[PDB]
């Protein structure tokens, strides 16, 4: 058992290393926790826990459509700001939007 609201894999962009690192993320009413693996029985200490009380989600990609074709890269990104700005990338626009929305309602402050 666990008061998990949402969990799943995400890539977080490194600020210095110019690369993404994939982690397994678990959203609770209190934190977004990062774990190395999805094994909630054996992998039990977060590599990082972001307190939601002082985060906000600001922007997200615009879907790849005829109205705004996104030639550059993926359209599955969002920004989580700490009160600096972490860039996360999900599997798809749809998955990204589920993370964004679920984060939004836990961080209205």
From Swiss-Prot:
Together with SLM2, acts as an effector of the TORC2- and calcineurin-signaling pathways. Phosphorylated and activated by TORC2 under favorable growth conditions. Mediates actin polarization via inhibition of calcineurin-dependent transcription. Upon nutrient limitation or environmental stress, gets dephosphorylated by calcineurin. Dephosphorylation inhibits its interaction with TORC2, thereby antagonizing TORC2 signaling and mediating calcineurin-dependent actin depolarization. It comes from Saccharomyces cerevisiae (strain ATCC 204508 / S288c). Residues 4-108 form the PH domain. Present with 5190 molecules/cell in log phase SD medium. It comes from the Eukaryota. This is Phosphatidylinositol 4,5-bisphosphate-binding protein SLM1. The chain holds residues 469 to 582 of 686 of the full protein. Phosphorylated by the target of rapamycin complex 2 (TORC2) and dephosphorylated by serine/threonine-protein phosphatase 2B (calcineurin). Dephosphorylated in response to the disruption or inhibition of sphingolipid synthesis. Heterodimer of SLM1-SLM2. Binds phosphatidylinositol 4,5-bisphosphate, which is required for function. Interacts with the TORC2 subunits AVO2, BIT61 and TOR2. Interacts with the calcineurin catalytic subunits CNA1 and CNA2. It is found in: Cell membrane.
């Amino acid at each position: 058992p666990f008061t998990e609201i949402k969990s799943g894999f995400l890539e977080r962009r490194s600020k210095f290393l110019k690369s993404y690192s994939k982690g397994y993320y678990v959203l609770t009413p209190n934190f977004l926790h990062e774990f190395k693996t999805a094994d909630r029985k054996k992998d039990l200490v977060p590599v990082m826990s972001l307190a939601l009380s002082e985060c906000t989600v600001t922007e997200h990609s615009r879907k790849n459509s005829t109205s705004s074709p996104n030639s550059t890269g993926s359209d599955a990104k969002f920004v989580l700001h700490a009160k600096h700005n972490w860039v996360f990338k999900a599997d798809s626009y749809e998955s990204m939007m589920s993370w964004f929305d679920n984060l939004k309602i836990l961080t209205s402050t």
